[PDB]
Amino acid sequence: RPTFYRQELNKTIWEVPERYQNLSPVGSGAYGSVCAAFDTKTGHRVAVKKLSRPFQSIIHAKRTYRELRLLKHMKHENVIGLLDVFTPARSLEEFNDVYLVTHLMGADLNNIVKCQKLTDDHVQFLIYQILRGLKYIHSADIIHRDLKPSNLAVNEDCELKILDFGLYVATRWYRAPEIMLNWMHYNQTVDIWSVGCIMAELLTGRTLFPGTDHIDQLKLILRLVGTPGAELLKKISSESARNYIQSLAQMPKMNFANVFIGANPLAVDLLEKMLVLDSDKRITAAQALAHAYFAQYHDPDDEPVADPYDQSFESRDLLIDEWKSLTYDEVISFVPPPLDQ
């Protein structure tokens, strides 16, 4: 067990191994309780996140367990990964705090679109990397569900990672119509809707669908993609939703080339395939990676899938001390990634 040292930072106590030096808070709460630090073992900058009240309730405890399980799973260049996880606790009985260590990223995509107006080449490479990470995530039966520009981070080399910072940019702006009202008929392609929204915004400099609420959001979406026809209406189970959609005056599908005027036609074609209202018909991440828009980047021998992920815990209803002990197990069994790079 290494030697820890203690300090106070913006109201909070931090107790971390000596290996991590010069802790300085970043992001002013946007990222949670996170410090940049220098990792003396690799000579690299890292991010250290201290979980906030990880075991305060059954719900926090489960969320803590879930976050650690997800992070320990992710081994891919376009998804955030776990460099280390530690607690100052010597036993299960005194286990109360959880620290997670990851690579430190340079900037989020929200801040980047807000600053700059990106080239078609940069949009190609950024959306390619998102999709490549999504192929991976989705292969493990994991759905992100909250993809938006502030959950994507890039380094100066334009290398991108998918993250989730959890609770400026409204989630609802990027959320798929089928999970706007109810959560009944949805698949991994909710994430592909989000990618379409993100890609639109990178291309134009403008939130594609800036709805004020769930109802407005849906109205903005239908104005672009058109009100559902007979076929898709047949698959809506919710009376109130179908009533709502059918109570609107009909709107035709827009021609996306008339909306994203001057964009690469291949970008426009992919957008048409991502922003389809029928989630059974929306392009998957794997299919999208083969789209001609990514011809410069796509290599089918280097778009890996994930190992299987045991999500059976999600259906369980356990006590706080049980979720805590499971989380402890996961801290203890953590094997760090190989150093070398």
Ligand SMILES: CCNC(=O)[C@H](CCC1CCCCC1)NC(=O)c1ccc(CNC(=O)c2cnn(-c3ccccc3)c2N)cc1
């Ligand atoms: C709701 C809580 N979510 C989670 O459970 C997920 C679990 C893993 C997900 C990964 C993506 C797929 C879905 C699972 N958890 C994390 O993603 C997750 C966990 C821990 C960390 C810690 N790292 C940072 O905070 C960090 C790194 N770079 N920068 C940086 C700096 C400047 C500018 C821009 C960025 C940060 N601020 C980072 C993400």
